[PDB]
Amino acid sequence: ETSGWEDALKWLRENTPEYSTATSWWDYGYWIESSLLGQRRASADGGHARDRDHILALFLARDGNISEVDFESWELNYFLVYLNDWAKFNAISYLGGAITRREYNGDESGRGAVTTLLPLPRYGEKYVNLYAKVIVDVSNSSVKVTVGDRECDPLMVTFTPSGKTIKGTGTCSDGNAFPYVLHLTPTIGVLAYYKVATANFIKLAFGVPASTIPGFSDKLFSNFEPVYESGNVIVYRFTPFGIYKIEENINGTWKQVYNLTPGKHELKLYISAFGRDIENATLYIYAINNEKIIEKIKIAEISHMDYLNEYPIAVNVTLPNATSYRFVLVQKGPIGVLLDAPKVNGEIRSPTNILREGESGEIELKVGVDKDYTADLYLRATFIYLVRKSGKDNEDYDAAFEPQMDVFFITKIGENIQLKEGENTVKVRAELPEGVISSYKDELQRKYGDKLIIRGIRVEPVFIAEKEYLMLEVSASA
């Protein structure tokens, strides 16, 4: 009765490191594996809690700059998008701050609600969502959309692979406004309210490069790589740093290549920085033979790169033989996966509020890692809160609540810790400055007044080491 969930999960356990981390909207991943099939491997296996629900939605429901959520700060490795989640997209869009309370579920007089997303499987020259009484007739190359009795005209219709784009009028024969966009693809079509027409979930789930920002869509598919799919579940491998385009100099002309051949090359690299800046990193190409690294070639050094304003990197490299090449970036990032409830002064605590403001104590942690790391250890705070961007107040149905995620390190309490592959134990003395939390919570209140709504304050322990990020792997060619 599974929608591919067991095939996908059961695939992850057999194809990813023992201490990987995955997420799914509303934790279907964890719930399927734990509650339905019985399982545990760490105090956590993915993201949880109502504050991540907000940030997960912010990513799924939005597009462009404001959707570049910092998944790396969660040491995220895999993302499982579930097609069926289209049915909940109204809530997802609401938590993600895309739509207002009214468009979410109507006002006091039951009017206004909208249908953010609606999938239209094919039928043959016709696309139709039986359950919603919607029919899309293209045959003749004009596109006729029937919604119930009415006849409605999109604000726009798109074809993919095609890329064609008819410009509708966004109105119904009812005379009413139909602010919807229709994306059509060989196997399915999707009708989407305008506020979520370019939604990343559409990009991941239904294969529609939907982006109101040039380049974004290419970059995003370099940060989220599909590695497996079953039914309505596609498992993507995240990476806050990837390469969406490799240009090679062929006769003083830059052309796009899709694999490299042994030998010297004059290249141009296009990196996508998803969620966080590139900070003092080193890039390498790893010649790979029989899935065996046979050489590590440093190719460049980026001191910094804006995550909302990348740029191409120039690089000349001589490459050995091997079957494939791996562009890797290495820089400071989070590592480790608590395997038990952290203890403080002997007692058990929450791995998300390890210490209270002002309180000090002896912290103990069982830490698992898939590689040998030398890391520092900090107490990092993470504020997740909403900021009402419309409406007279929080109850006004005009209200839409834009979710934010602020993360700052408070104090280093670890130092050159030699974490070795497998399980580890780390006892350390720590103290959380007096005021650090209330201080920030006051600065937020000062910036946003009543438009604010704290959803979750976290104070957790994080091991930061130099870690390798796989940006892209190409193949050796003739």
Ligand SMILES: [Ca+2]
């Ligand atoms: Ca970016």
Ligand SMILES: [Cl-]
């Ligand atoms: Cl972080």
